Amino acid sequence: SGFRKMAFPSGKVEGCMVQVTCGTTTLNGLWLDDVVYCPRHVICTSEDMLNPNYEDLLIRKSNHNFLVQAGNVQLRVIGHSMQNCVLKLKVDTANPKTPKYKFVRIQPGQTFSVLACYNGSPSGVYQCAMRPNFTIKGSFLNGSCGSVGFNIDYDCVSFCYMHHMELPTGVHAGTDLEGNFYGPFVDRQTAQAAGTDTTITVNVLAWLYAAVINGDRWFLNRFTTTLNDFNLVAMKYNYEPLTQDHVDILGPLSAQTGIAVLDMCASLKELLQNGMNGRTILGSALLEDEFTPFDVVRQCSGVTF
Amino acid sequence: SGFRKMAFPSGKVEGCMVQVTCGTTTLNGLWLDDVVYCPRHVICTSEDMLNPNYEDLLIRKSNHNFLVQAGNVQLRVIGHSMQNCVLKLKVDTANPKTPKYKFVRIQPGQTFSVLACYNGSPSGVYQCAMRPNFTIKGSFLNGSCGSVGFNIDYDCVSFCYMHHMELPTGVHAGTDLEGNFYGPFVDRQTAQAAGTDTTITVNVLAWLYAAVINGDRWFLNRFTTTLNDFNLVAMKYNYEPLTQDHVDILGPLSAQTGIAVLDMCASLKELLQNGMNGRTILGSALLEDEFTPFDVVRQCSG
Ligand SMILES: *C(#N)[C]([C][C]1[C][C][N]C1=O)[N]C(=O)[C]1[C][Si]([C])([C])[C]N1C(=O)[C]([N]C(=O)O[C])C([C])([C])[C]
Ligand SMILES: *C(#N)[C]([C][C]1[C][C][N]C1=O)[N]C(=O)[C]1[C][Si]([C])([C])[C]N1C(=O)[C]([N]C(=O)O[C])C([C])([C])[C]
Ligand SMILES: [Cl-]
Ligand SMILES: [Cl-]
Ligand SMILES: [Cl-]
Ligand SMILES: [Cl-]
Ligand SMILES: [Cl-]
Ligand SMILES: [Cl-]
Ligand SMILES: [Cl-]
Ligand SMILES: [Cl-]
Ligand SMILES: [Cl-]
């Protein structure tokens, strides 16, 4: 049947993307009801990008300094406010394409779909995971800020990420839709480095289950471990700890495949200590950690939206 | 910066996906204007899935044998005709969400986004390429037929694939939107084997250039090669031969990075000869062949 890196359908989010311009700076905004959300650094100027006083910059600004364009129609800004690192521009027209939505904050290891946009126009969609160091290994060029990450739960779009900046290593940092950053980063153009990253162990296990569901079984072995032994091995290899909750969440996959979670942990421990021996798993020579247990179940059961 | 496997936004295609039911068979349809396109095997009976005479089967059908459901509303089928392996159900309502679109047949090596759907509703979007053996390495379950592959230029959707079947290897086969199968496959449940799958060499080279654009350097070397010497080595690794057409296409990436095409070809030969030695390229331990030169330019540049 096959297994692919798959993003949620992006149609609901596409109808909310607009272009936000504060003079020279142009980026994307998320138009929900009568409010447009965008990074607050759009008001920054090259005079002081190093240490911007955002509260005082916004005081100088009036509604007329913000140009919002939805397609080929200009949206009238009738108010503006700042919440954390997101600017909220109130517009005179509610978005007729507003879907059932909610703002959520995700945890490290959870995945989401990113709709990369430029000049308010969606250009691509891809699936990524919030890394344990709170960055995302995205793909973003100039003008991509305001692009959002999201999941879909039943009929409801869950907005979880808005893109703000790129770190010197090529990884990306952003905030939730309340403007609070993921990770210890600030929206200033100064030297900032992401912490050492680690592998999302629970996601690796779920991906191994996806392989077993697809007939890839060479890595299974007779052995089992307990959570204590595996966690000691995992930390030695820069792998995140596996909690009892992670075992519970992997439960349905364990029942489906006949491979207990600690049974699979024995396979993963051998893979870490001995390598792939030239073999591949689902066409990959590395252990994929950007599939949650829910992603694997959803793709192997055909959940739609 | 950063390089990701990236699909086109699927919204323009979501507005066209519908559910098509004939008898006890349900799959997906593509609703463009007043026509719904779906695989013609939706009318195939369980009695004879080996040698179905689809033309004979469709003559015995009436418009009332086809149920089309768009959202919560039922469309009325007012006509039906067959073009190759695709069934065309005319409906009484034109889709108000029909986008600017065209039908294109693609060549091996070309990439496109797939909107996997079930019961007429979008489930997910992913990227894949037409393999050299004319299959695709997709992700499909029961009831996924009718799902389409597409690309988007500006605001125009190029529909290039419709899913029809899964081969015993687990790879997938389908047609263009005019119903013509890619490769030597038929929409019958008969013994069918795909050819040996090979690597899309031009796509690998474009991906190496993408790595260089994104700061990777470790695989570069001082060597170069002739085109024929590169092909002789590469074919021993089940890599597709590289033509002068591929060399020309890689020209813009070559100029941007300052690395000649045959220079990069020498790097590829080294990677095939040596492996990775614990290193990765763009976060991957294998060479990736599902980014075209067009994909690389679009993602890396404006
Ligand atoms: C938006 N639009 C852009 C997108 C960036 C640039 C290329 N790739 C991306 O992801 N983001 C920015 O302009 C932000 C706003 Si700022 C706090 C005035 C600077 N900035 C940055 O991304 C900068 N990086 C940084 O300071 O991280 C420590 C760079 C990339 C411009 C140096
Ligand atoms: C549609 N809907 C399905 C989706 C398939 C089945 C599981 N994974 C997929 O991608 N497609 C089919 O049922 C087709 C139509 Si048919 C000519 C009546 C049989 N078929 C098949 O995929 C079959 N394979 C085959 O005949 O290859 C020669 C199997 C997989 C159902 C035996
Ligand atoms: Cl401040
Ligand atoms: Cl305020
Ligand atoms: Cl993807
Ligand atoms: Cl920018
Ligand atoms: Cl064993
Ligand atoms: Cl999880
Ligand atoms: Cl689950
Ligand atoms: Cl793309
Ligand atoms: Cl035919």
Swiss-Prot record, chain A:
Residues 1-305 are cytoplasmic. It catalyses: TSAVLQ-|-SGFRK-NH2 and SGVTFQ-|-GKFKK the two peptides corresponding to the two self-cleavage sites of the SARS 3C-like proteinase are the two most reactive peptide substrates. The enzyme exhibits a strong preference for substrates containing Gln at P1 position and Leu at P2 position. Changing K90R: In strain: Beta/B.1.351. Changing Q189A: Does not affect ability to cleave and inactivate human TRMT1. The active site is at H41, C145. There is a cross-link at K5, K90 (Glycyl lysine isopeptide (Lys-Gly) (interchain with G-Cter in ubiquitin)). It is found in: Host cytoplasm; Host Golgi apparatus; Host nucleus. It comes from the Viruses. Residues 1-305 form the Peptidase C30 domain. Inhibited by pyridone-containing alpha-ketoamides compounds 13a and 13b. In turn, alpha-ketoamide 13b (tert-butyl (1-((S)-1-(((S)-4-(benzylamino)-3,4-dioxo-1-((S)-2-oxopyrrolidin-3-yl)butan-2-yl)amino)-3-cyclopropyl-1-oxopropan-2-yl)-2-oxo-1,2-dihydropyridin-3-yl)carbamate) inhibits SARS-CoV-2 replication in human lung cells. Inhibited ex vivo by michael acceptor inhibitor N3. Inhibited ex vivo by compound 11a and 11b. Cleaves the C-terminus of replicase polyprotein at 11 sites. Recognizes substrates containing the core sequence [ILMVF]-Q-|-[SGACN]. Cleaves and inactivates human TRMT1, preventing tRNA guanine(26)-dimethylation of tRNAs. May cleave human NLRP1 in lung epithelial cells, thereby activating the NLRP1 inflammasome pathway. May cleave human GSDMD, triggering alternative GSDME-mediated epithelial cell death upon activation of the NLRP1 inflammasome, which may enhance the release interleukins 1B, 6, 16 and 18. Also able to bind an ADP-ribose-1''-phosphate (ADRP). 3CL-PRO exists as monomer and homodimer. Only the homodimer shows catalytic activity. Interacts with host FBXO22; this interaction promotes the proteasomal degradation of nsp5. This is 3C-like proteinase nsp5. It comes from Severe acute respiratory syndrome coronavirus 2. The chain holds residues 3264 to 3568 of 4405 of the full protein.
UniProtKB/Swiss-Prot annotation, chain B:
It catalyses: TSAVLQ-|-SGFRK-NH2 and SGVTFQ-|-GKFKK the two peptides corresponding to the two self-cleavage sites of the SARS 3C-like proteinase are the two most reactive peptide substrates. The enzyme exhibits a strong preference for substrates containing Gln at P1 position and Leu at P2 position. The active site is at H41, C145. Inhibited by pyridone-containing alpha-ketoamides compounds 13a and 13b. In turn, alpha-ketoamide 13b (tert-butyl (1-((S)-1-(((S)-4-(benzylamino)-3,4-dioxo-1-((S)-2-oxopyrrolidin-3-yl)butan-2-yl)amino)-3-cyclopropyl-1-oxopropan-2-yl)-2-oxo-1,2-dihydropyridin-3-yl)carbamate) inhibits SARS-CoV-2 replication in human lung cells. Inhibited ex vivo by michael acceptor inhibitor N3. Inhibited ex vivo by compound 11a and 11b. Residues 1-302 are cytoplasmic. Changing M49A: Does not affect ability to cleave and inactivate human TRMT1. It is found in: Host cytoplasm; Host Golgi apparatus; Host nucleus. There is a cross-link at K5, K90 (Glycyl lysine isopeptide (Lys-Gly) (interchain with G-Cter in ubiquitin)). Changing P132H: In strain: Omicron/BA.1, Omicron/BA.2, Omicron/BA.2.12.1, Omicron/BA.2.75, Omicron/BA.4, Omicron/BA.5, Omicron/BQ.1.1, Omicron/XBB.1.5, Omicron/EG.5.1. Changing C145A: Complete loss of 3C-like proteinase nsp5 cleavage. Residues 1-302 form the Peptidase C30 domain. This is 3C-like proteinase nsp5. It comes from Severe acute respiratory syndrome coronavirus 2.
